[PDB]
């Protein structure tokens, strides 16, 4: 829908208006890499965390991997300058990622006790910084 509702290909501008996708892509790569590194540097096995990760993007948001995938989704959709498809992408990814985040959050709440509870009290925003 971003492809179709977006305008014809060579008419989108350049110059100083194509620096936003650059910095946003750099931000989403940096934040995803930080999230994956901080998630993987503690776990013994593939996904078996030992302690609670509360460093880097985890101190801005409770699920930075999913929000980074979300942000590169928005980056592709914004490179072609189509807000409505970005909104529908946001809706569907919010629904599924929120469902999966709810199951994983209740799993680590059950498994870790008070630690993830105080971590979630420190940072409530699940996907978007002070928006969700």
């Amino acid at each position: 829908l971003a492809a179709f509702e977006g305008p014809e290909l060579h008419r989108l501008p350049g110059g100083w208006a194509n620096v936003g996708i650059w910095i946003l892509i750099v931000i989403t790569m940096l934040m995803h890499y930080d999230s994956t590194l901080y998630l993987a540097r503690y776990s013994e096995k593939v996904v078996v965390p030992t302690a609670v990760v509360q460093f880097g993007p985890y101190r801005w948001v409770r699920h930075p991997i999913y929000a980074s995938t979300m942000l590169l989704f928005a980056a592709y959709c914004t490179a072609l300058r189509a807000p409505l498809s970005l909104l529908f992408l946001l809706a569907v990814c919010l629904v599924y990622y929120n469902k999966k985040a709810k199951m994983e959050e209740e799993l680590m709440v059950e498994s870790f006790g008070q630690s993830y509870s105080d971590y979630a009290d420190k940072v409530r925003h699940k996907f978007i910084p002070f928006v969700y």
Partner: protein, 50 residues
């Protein structure tokens, strides 16, 4: 003779238990030692993203 019985009849049961345990482990591991079917790398670990 002046010598009555010595260490036990109980630690003999303990060393017999150790002997039997190791014997059964050796007997088991001599039959089911090799069952290898496949080793595929999970280069698409879906729980990380999907």
């Amino acid at each position: 003779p002046m010598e009555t019985q010595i260490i036990s009849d109980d630690t003999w049961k303990l060393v017999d238990e150790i002997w039997d345990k190791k014997v059964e482990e050796i007997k088991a591991e001599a039959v089911i030692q090799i069952e290898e079917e496949k080793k595929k790398p999970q280069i698409l670990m879906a729980t990380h993203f999907f």
